[PDB]
Structures are given as C-alpha cells and as structure tokens.
Design a protein around this ligand. Sequence first.
Ligand code: AGS
Ligand code: AGS
Ligand code: AGS
Ligand code: K
Ligand code: K
Ligand code: K
Ligand code: K
Ligand code: MG
Ligand code: MG
Ligand code: MG
Ligand code: MG
Lengths: 525, 525, 525, 137
Amino acid sequence: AAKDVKFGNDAGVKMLRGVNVLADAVKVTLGPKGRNVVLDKSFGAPTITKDGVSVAREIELEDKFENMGAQMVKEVASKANDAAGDGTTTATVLAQAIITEGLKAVAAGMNPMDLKRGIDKAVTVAVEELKALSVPCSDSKAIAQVGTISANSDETVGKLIAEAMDKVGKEGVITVEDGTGLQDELDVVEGMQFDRGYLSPYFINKPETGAVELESPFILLADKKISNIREMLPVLEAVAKAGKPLLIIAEDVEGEALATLVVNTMRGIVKVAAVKAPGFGDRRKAMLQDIATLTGGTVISEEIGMELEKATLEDLGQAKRVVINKDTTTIIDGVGEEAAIQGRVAQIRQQIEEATSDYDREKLQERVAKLAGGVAVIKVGAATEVEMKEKKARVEDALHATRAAVEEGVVAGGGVALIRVASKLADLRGQNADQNVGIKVALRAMEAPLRQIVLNCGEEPSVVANTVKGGDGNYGYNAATEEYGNMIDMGILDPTKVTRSALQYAASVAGLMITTECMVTDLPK
Amino acid sequence: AAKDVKFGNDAGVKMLRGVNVLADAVKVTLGPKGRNVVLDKSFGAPTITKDGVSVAREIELEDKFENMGAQMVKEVASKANDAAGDGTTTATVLAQAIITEGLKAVAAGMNPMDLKRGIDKAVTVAVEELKALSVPCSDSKAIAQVGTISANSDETVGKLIAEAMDKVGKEGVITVEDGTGLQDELDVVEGMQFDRGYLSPYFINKPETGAVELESPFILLADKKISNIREMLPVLEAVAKAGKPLLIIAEDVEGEALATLVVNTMRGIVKVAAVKAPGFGDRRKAMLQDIATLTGGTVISEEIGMELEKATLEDLGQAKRVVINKDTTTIIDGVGEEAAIQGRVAQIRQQIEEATSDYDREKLQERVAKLAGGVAVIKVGAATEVEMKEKKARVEDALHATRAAVEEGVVAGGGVALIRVASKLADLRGQNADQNVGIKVALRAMEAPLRQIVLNCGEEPSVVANTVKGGDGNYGYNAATEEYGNMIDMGILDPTKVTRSALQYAASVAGLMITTECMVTDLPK
Amino acid sequence: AAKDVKFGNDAGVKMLRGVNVLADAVKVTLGPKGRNVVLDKSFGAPTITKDGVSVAREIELEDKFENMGAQMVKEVASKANDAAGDGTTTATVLAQAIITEGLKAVAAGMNPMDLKRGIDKAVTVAVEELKALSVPCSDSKAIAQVGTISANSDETVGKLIAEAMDKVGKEGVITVEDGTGLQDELDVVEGMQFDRGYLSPYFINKPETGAVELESPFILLADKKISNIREMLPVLEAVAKAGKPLLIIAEDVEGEALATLVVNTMRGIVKVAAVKAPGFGDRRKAMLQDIATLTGGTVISEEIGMELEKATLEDLGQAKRVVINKDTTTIIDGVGEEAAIQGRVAQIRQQIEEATSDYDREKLQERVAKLAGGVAVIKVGAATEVEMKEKKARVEDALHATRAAVEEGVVAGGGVALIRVASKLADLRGQNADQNVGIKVALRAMEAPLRQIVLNCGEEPSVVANTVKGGDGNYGYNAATEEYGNMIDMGILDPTKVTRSALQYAASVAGLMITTECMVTDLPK
Amino acid sequence: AAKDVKFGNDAGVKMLRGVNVLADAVKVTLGPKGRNVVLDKSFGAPTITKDGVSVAREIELEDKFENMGAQMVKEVASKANDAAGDGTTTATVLAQAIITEGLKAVAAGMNPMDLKRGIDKAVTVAVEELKALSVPC
Ligand SMILES: Nc1ncnc2c1ncn2[C@@H]1O[C@H](COP(=O)(O)OP(=O)(O)OP(O)(O)=S)[C@@H](O)[C@H]1O
Ligand SMILES: Nc1ncnc2c1ncn2[C@@H]1O[C@H](COP(=O)(O)OP(=O)(O)OP(O)(O)=S)[C@@H](O)[C@H]1O
Ligand SMILES: Nc1ncnc2c1ncn2[C@@H]1O[C@H](COP(=O)(O)OP(=O)(O)OP(O)(O)=S)[C@@H](O)[C@H]1O
Ligand SMILES: [K+]
Ligand SMILES: [K+]
Ligand SMILES: [K+]
Ligand SMILES: [K+]
Ligand SMILES: [Mg+2]
Ligand SMILES: [Mg+2]
Ligand SMILES: [Mg+2]
Ligand SMILES: [Mg+2]
C-alpha cells in the first residue's frame, strides 16, 4: 500500500513522542513505591497493576510513526525479560534516558554514529565495572540469604532453594509443584532439560508463566522434519484415546503440520505441543536418543526405514510432567527404567574416555550431566489451597532470582550500582567530542533508575541522587523506609545479571534509534 | 478505467519527486557508515535495516505519478541485483544523480534525445575504462584474498572458497550447506545446474534468497508441455505419500496446470515447483535425458506413447537437494548410479568425436562438463547451531562476491573507481552541445557514490571528493577509519562486475525517464 | 439509465478535448525520434513504450463525452491497424489535424455536410495522386531491398523473403517458424490459406501476434452450423486422447457451442479453436472439400445423413501446424496424400475447361491456386534461443512490410509523400466555399505527419516543412540524421498501402465527428 | 510596515511573470502590422493605441513581486525613450528575450554573475559592430 516516509528531525520527534508515552506509562510502576496503572478490559473491571511488562503490552499509539517508536523501545523490555526475566521497567527508563538526550544531541548537530560509539564504549566499560563490583553468591548460605530476601524475608523459601541446589547443583534443574498439603517436599526424579522452546505460542496453556504444561503426556521422538499431517494422523488418534496429551520432539515441525496442531489443540481436539530436537547435526540424533532412554520411547528415524504412520502408543515415550518456555523444554520424571538410563550413562561415560577432542569431550559430559543429573522437584507446603498457591508463587520468584544471583552475583539495588559505576567512569573519553557527548549521555542515563524510584516515592530525585552520589560503596536510599543506609545490610540487592541486561538492551535499542534516518509506514488510510 | 494523463514538465516534476523519495530513503544506508531505516510491520516490532533492497521493496507512493517514478527507478536496483547480486544502493544513487541533472537540462530546453545519447556515450566509454583499470582474480591466492575480505577478514572462509574452486574450477558449481558440527567439509557430489528458474514466484520458500529449496525431492521429467492438471493428479498423489516434495522439469507448465500448482503448494498441499527444461528443439530432449541419467529418473515423452497418468514413483528421478533461482536450477547429489552416469558421459564423449560441426561440438562438450563436473558442496563448521548458521551466511556472501571477482576482476571500492574513470573522460565530447551536457551529467553522477558514503559518515562530500580527485590511482577515502590511503592496500574492493552493472542499469533507466514525454495512470478514484 | 444529452457546440468541444488527449499521448511516439510514454500497471514496473497502439489501448477518460471522442478516433488506429498493420500513429495525427480544423470551421458557422464533402473529395483525389507517385516493388531485387530495410538493414532477412516469394510467388502464402538451430531453412509444403479468422478471441494463445497457433492438430470439417455441444462431445473426447489440439472448420459455431469451447479451452481442458468455412453457398461445400483433400479428412455433412456423434479420429483431417488471425486461417503442411491432392487439382482443372462463365472460371482458378500453390515456410536461424526468437520477430515484420510493398508499391517516407500530394492539389475546388474550406482542411492535415516527426526531433516543424515543400520529388528530411536528401536513396520508404489507409481512415472518422450533432451518454452516476 | 521577502527561484518566477505580462501587452504593437491595445478610462470611450509607451504606462500588477518585475523592465522603455525618443517597444521585447533565457539558465544552475558578464560582453561588441554597419547621415 502507499507509504508515508519521514526523514531526520521529522522522524525523530515522532519516535521520541512514542517512546515517551510508553516509557512514562511504564516507569510509574518502578520500585517499592511504584504507582498503579489501570488497563481497560473489554469486559468487567479494569486491570490494576504495578507490573511494567503488563503495562508495556497494552501500549499501541494512533500516530503510525509514534507507534513505531513505542514498539521499538518495547523491544528493550521484552529482550531484557527473555534474558533475565526481571528489570524490564529499569531497562525501559534507561532506554528513555539515553534516547532523549541522544536525540537532543542529534538535533544539536552532533554526529549520530559518534554518539552511538560513545554510548557503546561507556556501556562496555560500565559492564566490566559492574562485574568488578559484583559480590558472588556461591555457597549455600549466600544462596539461602538471597532466596530469603527474594521471598519477602521468608527464610523457609531460602532454605528450600538452598537444599534444592545442594541436591542437583546450582546449575541443575529445579521445579516447583503444588504440595500434597502442609509441609514442603524435595525429591530428585529422573528428568532432563534442553534448550528448545515451543514451536509457537498458543501451545501456552498457562499465560501466567507464558509457558506450556502437560501432565503424564506421551512423547513422540521423530528424527526428521514433519510437514504433512497425514503422518501424524495414525499416532494422534492413538493418543486421542487413553486421554493423554502429546509432546512432539522432532527435528522440526513446519507450517502445514504445525498450523494444524495449533488449530486442533486450539479446539480442545487433543492436547499437543511441538518443540525442536536439541542440538544439530550428528549430536542431535545421539541426544534425541538420550530423551528416548529417559522417557522409555523409541526414536522414529527414516534412516532405519521407520514411518510415523506405523507408530503405536508403545513407541511413544512418557513422563509425569513436561514444561516448555519460549526457549526451554523440561521433562520431569520420565518412565524410562533406571536400568536403561544408567546403562546409557555408562556408554556415554566411555565415550568420554575414547574422546580424542576436548570439544567432543565437553559435549559428551554435557549429556551425561543431563541424563545423570535428574530434576529436583520442590512441592510447596500448604494449609489451605489459597495459601499453598501463594507460597508456590513466592518460591517460584525467589528461585528465579537466586538462580540469576548464582550466575553473576549481586550488586546494590535501588539503582545505586549503576550510579556507582557512572561515577567511576567520569574520566572516560572517546575519539572526539561527539563520542564524549555520547559517553556523558550514557553516564547520565545511569542515574535515571534511582531518580525514578525516588520520584515514585514522592521525594526529590535531585536531592536524593546528590546525597547518594555524595557517599560511596553500598551507601544508598531505601525507598521503602525513606532512609539512607547500606543497601546490602538493608537487604536491597539486584542480580548483577538483570542490571547488566537492562543496561545493554537499553543501549542497544537506543543506539539504533539514534542512528535512524528514515521511517516508512502505511499511509493512515 | 478513466485515466489521468500528464505531459512534459508536469510529468517530469512528478517523476523526479517520486525517484527522490525512493533514492533518499535508500541512499542513507550506503557504505560502512550507512544509517538505519525503520520499516513498519503490521504486527510486532518494526524492521530496522541498513540494506537498500529491503528499503526499496517497501517504497510505494500515494500520488500515482510520483509512484510511477519510484517504481521505474526501483527497476534499477532489482536488475542490478539480479545481474550482480550487490550494489543496488549504489545503482540507485547513480540513477538519482543522472535523472536529477538530466531532467534539469530538459527543463532548460535541451534536447532529451541528445542528452540521453551523451549519457550513453559516457557510460559506454566508462565501462571500457573500468575494464582497463580492473585487476584480475585468477589464481587461488587472489581468490583466497577476495574471499577472506568478503568474509570480514575470515581467512578460513577464504581458504574454503579457494579449495572449492580448485576442485570444480572457478567456473564450476559450488553450494554451501549446514555442517554436521564443528570443522568444515568439502566434497564433490553428482550434480548439475542449468539456466532455468522457477516458472513463477510463490514457489520461493526462502525469500531470504528469493529462491526455492527442496530436500530429497522427486523429479518428474516430462518431455512435453503440461496444461491439464488431470495428467498430474495420479503422480502428484503418489508423491503425496512418501512425504517428499516434487520438482517438475517439463517442456513448460502452462496457466491451468501452473495455476493449480501455485495454489496447492500455497496451502501446504504437497510441495511442488516447476521449471522449464534446458535448451530447446532437439538438444532439449537429449539434455532432459542427461538429467534423468543423473537423478535416476525416466523421461515421459509422448513420442514413445507415454502418459503422465501411467507414471509411478519409480519413473521419477531423485536428488538430495535442489535449488532454483529466478533463472537457474541446480540439482545437488542425484540418485543416478555412477554406472549409468559415467556411461552416459562416454556416449556424449564419442558424440564429440563424430562431431562434424563446431557448434554441435561445443553443445556436446557443455553437456559432458555438466554431467561429469558435479557440484562442490561446502559444509560450514559449527560449535553451536547459532554460530554455524552465521558462518554459513558469511561463506555464502563471500562465495558470491568471489565468484563475481573471478568473472571481471576488482577495482578500488568506496566509489573511487568511478571517480578515477570520470576524470579520465574529461575530454570526452559528443556530436553537439546538448550531447556534451549529457556527457557531463553522467561524469558528475559518477561522483555520487563516494559523496554519499562520505555524507553518511558525517563528513564533507566536496572536501573529500576534492581530495580524492586530487590524488590518483587507488588513492581513496576509507570511510570506516576516516583516513585517506590506498584502497587496495586497505582491502576496500568492489567486483568490477557490480560497479559496471550499477552504472549501466542506472543510465539505462535514467535515459528512459529523460526521454519520457507522457504518463498515463488510473484516476485517483 | 438516465442519460446526459449534449448538442452542437457543447458536444463539439467535448469531442475535441477527448481526441486531443488521445492524439497528444499517441503522437509523441511518431518517427525515429519518437518519445517514450509510460503506462502504469497494477503490479510491478510501469510499461515504457514508443508504440502508438499500446498507448491508445490505455486511453480512457473520466468525462463521458470526452471519452466518447477519444474512443471514436481510437477506431481510426484500430481500423488502419487491421487493414495495413502499420501507420496507426500517422493515422491518428492526420485525424486530429482534420477534426481540429474541421470543428473550428463548424464553430465558425460553416456547413458540416459541405466540409465533409470537401474533405472527402480531397482524399479521393489524394489517393489517386498517391497511386501515381507509387513506385513498384515487383522484381526480387526490389523485394530484397524492401525486406532488408524493413529488417533493420539485415540483408539476410531480405534474401529470405525474396527467396520465399520466388518459391510460392509474391502473392503466395508464407510463414515463419522457429528454426532447428543456426542457419535458416526454406521449404514449400502442402498448405493453404483462406479468409476466415477465429470465431472469437481467447482462442488466441499467442497475444504477441494476437493470433492462434496449433501444432499437429486434428481438423474437423463439418458442413453445417454447430449450436449444441452434444454433437461435439463424442469427437472432442476422441481428440482428448492422442493429446492433440482440434481445429473446427464448420459452416459456423454459434453461441451455445462456441461459448463452451471458449470456456473449456480456457481451462486447459482440450485445446480447440473454431473458424467459419471459406466462401458461402455452393462454392462453400466444394471448398470445404478442398480442405479435406489437403488435410486428409472427411467432410461431415447432414446432406449425406452424417452425424458428428458418429465421427472418429479417422474422419478428422490433420496438419503439422495451423495459424489463425483476426480474419485469416492458414493450414501448414497437411497430411493429405499428393495422390488425392494432385488428383483433386486435375478435377478442378477440368472444371475450368467446362467453365461457361468468367465468374465460375475465376472462382475455380482460385481453388487450384490455393490447393496447388502450397505454403513456403521460413525457419529462422538461431545460435541461442533468445537471438532466434528475436530474428524471428524481425523476419515476421520485414515480411509483413514487404508484402504490403508488393501490393501497392512504396512512396517517400517521413511524411513527404502526403506533402507532395497536397501540393499537387493546390487548385482542387468543390461546389461551394464551405467545400473549398473542407478541401484545404484536408490538404493542411496532410502536412501533420512530417511536422510531428520533426517536432519529436526537437526541430522546428514550420522551417523543415517549408524547406521540404520548397524542393520536390523524393526530397525530404531524414529525422534520424537530421539532414535533407533523397528519401528513396536514404532508404526511408513507406508502403503506399499504409499511407493510403492512414489517410482514408483518418478522413472517414473525422467526417463522422464533423457531422455529429448530438451525443448521448449515461449520467455520471 | 511588515514586509514579504522572497529569495532565489521564488523571487525569479515572480519577476519573470511580471515582465511577461508587461512585455506581452507591449510587443503586440510592434511594427507596421502592430495590433491595437485597448486601455480603459474612468470616463468615456477607452483608448485604442498601437503605441508601446502608452501601453507600458498603464501596466501595474496585483501581486507585489510580479509588479516589481514589471516596473523594473518598465525602466528599460522609459530610459530608451528619454535617450532616443523611440524604440521603447523594441527595447521591451529585447529585455524580455534576455530575461527569459537568462533566468532559465540561472534555474539550470549556471552562475548569474557569469551570465551577466557574457551578456555584457556580447552587447559591448555588438555596439561596436553596429557602428561599423552604420551609414552616416
Ligand atoms: N526498599 C527499596 N529501596 C530502593 N529500591 C528498591 C527497594 N526494594 C526494591 N528496590 C529496587 O526496585 C527495582 C525493581 O523494581 P521493579 O518495580 O520490580 O521493576 P523492574 O524489575 O525494573 O521491572 P519489572 O519488575 O520487570 S517490571 C530494583 O532496582 C530494586 O533494587
Ligand atoms: N571502509 C570503507 N570505506 C569506504 N567505502 C567502503 C568501505 N567498506 C565498504 N565500502 C563501499 O561501500 C559500498 C557498498 O555499500 P553497501 O551499503 O553494501 O551498498 P550497495 O552494495 O551499493 O547496495 P546493497 O548492499 O545492495 S544495498 C561499496 O562502494 C564499497 O566499496
Ligand atoms: N529517418 C527517418 N526520417 C524521417 N522519417 C522516418 C525515418 N525513419 C522512419 N520514418 C517515418 O516514421 C513513420 C513511422 O513511424 P512510427 O513511429 O512507426 O509510426 P506509425 O507507423 O505511423 O504508427 P505505429 O508504428 O503503428 S504506431 C513513417 O512516416 C516513416 O517514413
Ligand atoms: K513494579
Ligand atoms: K548498506
Ligand atoms: K513509434
Ligand atoms: K507601434
Ligand atoms: Mg522486578
Ligand atoms: Mg552491498
Ligand atoms: Mg510503424
Ligand atoms: Mg516607433
């Protein structure tokens, strides 16, 4: 269709207006004193939230160009979300701060490419500096502390997570399920988790977690691509009976077949979800087999002249439960017999012996760890279904936060970590004045999170920022009590991973907008 | 429908406005310092690109006359793209420069026909001069260098391409496929490539390459035209099973039958693609047979009273993979047995002996080369599916660039080649003044690429242009480092072929617009 | 529907405006220095052409009355096209010139009927004078020259045409087909051509020539009208097999049956084309038989109690190829055996002996000539399918032009012929002053072609016209070199037939418009 | 009072339009076959003339910029009139011819100062040549 095309300044003011509407709606929810945002629904009472992602998802603007700016920066939150699962609001205020001052510098005549280079250099050094200030979370005591703090001071949740990580290792798989009633339960079952998410949304039966969950499902392990539904018809019907859901783990499920699965499972006509097989090439087949040995299934490969049509419920694997995210599939408690599984382990164990290459050695050790590691399951205590469902949510969050903490450590929260990093880069310089302006744009933006947290408290941003900058180390502002103090001692911590991600994604998208010269969109008609 | 009709100047300003919108949106993406263009999408985040072709595809204007001018010059990019697979942005800025000054001259009262003639003469001489300045790329060391440079200094990709061309010759067929995992692979398989593209788009399943790709498909070799789908019904269904795609290599697939194929394969209902048989007349049948021998299929000609209805999956040929462009079909690794194939080679080999005419001799040698040459296959290394998919892209581009370099050599990049050529034509004259103006219009336009690259850097076009013209040889401006130097020593090269094509297509379309007196389009109703 | 009705002047200005938009869009393409016209398409790049007929086809106007004027004069081009196959643009500029001055005279109060009479008288005398100046093209040398000139100076095409006409006579049938590859081929086969075109478009499988072409088809020779498809069902299916197209040569194919044929052959469902049988009355049957004897078929007449239902593929005639225009059917190389054919010739040969009437004698001689003359076939050389298809086009045109040249000779091109004729009629007078004005309007219009050619060159019409008129004979202006000289010596010739047709049709349509008093069209609603 | 200010091309088209109205009205009266121009009067019958000066005096345009162009070229005729007392119409058609093509060249991107310099050189030499051709009286 005919297009509307805008260049330079005209495009720039539009983009800025768009990010401002999105960022302003989102940032009011930041921190302990975050304000509520009311989101209208077509039916019933409006949604009232303090969750940044919930607000961002609703934002769409009428002006086509302004809307592009909002959708672009919306990418910041989503990516930060996918990478760290927290700090999407922080990332959005950082992006708005960099974009605002960056576009001003552009309008002033400064070189966009140089501004971006300066911003990027500052971020590169800032991340290194962030790592230097990071405090490790390696021993179980630390893990327990972070867990407790993330569970609203519930030492119970802290001990649970610490024990779970002591079982399967801090790098191991850990899940949480409803409890049998009163008292928590922690047991390790035969399970595995690989990096492959659902082949499309819709499969998502629990939008609360934006994931797909199946109970006691059958697992089809096809070593090939599936384009024609015909091949599935025989097995899908065999699964239609026994009233159990089906998990498709094939090399890939293309359009035709996938489209059908999305439509049928959409009408309650058999619950089926598909995900790509882990790895690629040779190791792929070997890994597809590990899943079979674990779930007690049979790989259906064309290499041995096998057909999906000639596949019965006996070939299918099975597990008590499977969960899949946007990019992760976890099989909990497989039917496979410890004899077959443990044997498979022994095999791969020798593979490592005969390993003539570190790479092949690494890849093999990865499989044994997955197949021999299992999956720790945390069954949340109870005393009434309501409280149980609640504690479960806390455990889930605490667990998520502790996991991130374990990966990259923790830093002072309340935005002070970024403020401390900014002060350490006061002498950073680039190749020219425009690059230096870019550097300053970024260091200035690093104060935005703390400032917005203070603003939401109803206090003066410049005053608090000035005071915090006046001190050093973990000295910061506790927005809940409105008192200054040591952020670590007051238990206000952020996983270094979410702070780093919020900053990198904000800068990444800001850099793109700052160097955008033209925008194309459909004519408002 | 009622038409709007415009003449002379009225039409001219409309066209100019149209090419300016397109050229201006596209040209900001030129060179190492190209800026981003944001393209709106109906769903999700907008597309942010620095790729000229991506931008051009989106351009369509509201005013019908302005739109015509944009679509006309859009043909420049597309043709240059089809011919050299690069330099579409350069071609567009050259076209804008010629059109702008040429239309100005027309408005000044100069003769359009003479202007065009002068422009054409300049381009004709410029192309000859471009060839003179071209540096060959014949030995494997040169091929390796070009390949390395085109692969972002990846000496690995350079060696690969060099070795691949050393196997099948620099004029041989080369393909790249995903690797089995870590470490690259180079092996020659039984394959062939003929000059025939898809009988219509849509078949294109990979718009990234604007090509059609089929894996382990069946190949129907019908020696006749196919108009009625009825004939196909039996075979299409046989192919429906076995779950394999079908490649139709007939004399031609006309409307009725073709239309159906486009619709069915559009609905996932059996994946089928059709292309015309290579050559024409007698040799056609002989060649169609070479394909059969290679894929292990059976030609279904009416001459022997054979019907497509009475054709089973046993008659169909087969290969591990086939790729088809806008005008090229390549069959990779055919089922045919070396016995039959090598035997077929021997036959044609004697044919050359009994050859009583050079023409027939040439044609026969062409077949043997194709049937005996094979197809070099490059399997990209790995170490994680992500990196593997990435390196594969680099190898693809590097290969494409190197291939072009091998055909016509290389010249200084950054727009200096065209600038050196222009200076060498300062004394070029035509049959009259208007023709001389035409010549100058062209010579002036030849500076546009370098000027736009500099402009995108944020530097001063005239100053850099002036300085570069001041020197000579490969002296140029490195836009990445913003330093002057020897373009070749700095590794900034352009295949002579893409520079030549960009210039010729730009002049071609510009000459047509310059000599346009009337425009007809639908009334805006 | 309610109508809008206009009279006199009101209608006249509308008509004039309409012919002016059409004529102005078309005339810019006249001559060697013709300008391009861009025609918008719904998809892809617009069409850029210098072809008058392509431009005219697109012209439709919004104002209903203006549109009528455009569609009316559009009939000039089409009729001149159908009659001579060239000079449609020349015809259109002559028409605009006559209409413009004619309508001015009407507005000035002159009698429309007298104006028309005067224009008609001038044209009548002009055509006679044109025949007087016409130079013959009888000998093979002349034929070769005209052919060479018409083939863009390709002396090869010139020899071919000359040889082809030397074989079957300059009045004989000649066709051109794709070559076998390199080197031209000329062979006389058993063929025939009669004056009957397709019974409707659509059958046209090659819009490039706007004709229908069938290869090795079956020929149904039904001596009666065909209204019900039922009769055909049996034979159509018999032809469904053997995979061969069918040519229906019946007394006529009416609605019901014809409509079906158009729809089925439209869906690839059997390729069939229908044309009326040559002649009428008695001779018709006798001729329909000549076709049978030639194609080896059997006439299915109801006179002998024969039914189309009881007709097998054995009754149908057959030939290697048949081509049918808007009003011509040519059967190339029929299956008929020289025994039957030559015998048939002997029969008709005696018929001429027993002829008691010149008319019957003439009609009989016509049949023997057609049945005994055959068809010279020209197979264009090759060396790549592309060049072959191109040269074929040139030979086609060169042949078409030479044919016309042979019929009425040639005259000086560049519009000097009409200029010479006009000057010879300077004393022509009519019955009254108004008729004299009509005469002058026509003589004046005769200068229009030369003037427009010069105008498209960018030169001054009045200066060149004045100079050409100053000389005499073949003295004219060479628009390609912009030099005066002898048009004949410079090889700038026009078939007298196209010049005569352009003038007569232009005057014809102009006379109708000049004598139109009222216009009726639908209300713009 | 507040002013309207125009630059380059915008100004050029306005001027050209203004001189064209004046020149076109004036030049129809040139030579033995000059045509009549009717000039309205507030009272009585209009003035019918073939005299260029009479026509030029009446020309004033509504658009302020176009009017400036007319008044400027009007200076040509008056000065030629004061200097030689004849040829004001000839001076006006020469002015329009130079202005028209000169402005076209400017719009084509040619240097205004150089165009003027060239025109000046041609006139300087043309005047010398005119003296050579001149027959004494
Ligand atoms: N008492 C406190 N004083 C100051 N800052 C605090 C306090 N408690 C938490 N925070 C900080 O508030 C920020 C987190 O606020 P949230 O509202 O959860 O936003 P976000 O994590 O950036 O984005 P969401 O949660 O994905 S929307 C972190 O910087 C915390 O350190
Ligand atoms: N460091 C450099 N300095 C100067 N010019 C460079 C440099 N690197 C690449 N170039 C030139 O930039 C041009 C290629 O830029 P691109 O943006 O890829 O446009 P294009 O190839 O003309 O069109 P696309 O790629 O089809 S959009 C060529 O003229 C290169 O020689
Ligand atoms: N060198 C030449 N000098 C002058 N007239 C020429 C020359 N070459 C061709 N012509 C004339 O150009 C006319 C033919 O021009 P075309 O553009 O083909 O138009 P047309 O044949 O009148 O109509 P079309 O072709 O059906 S659109 C004839 O009058 C030719 O004699
Ligand atoms: K919040
Ligand atoms: K680019
Ligand atoms: K033409
Ligand atoms: K006068
Ligand atoms: Mg949070
Ligand atoms: Mg490029
Ligand atoms: Mg013609
Ligand atoms: Mg005087």
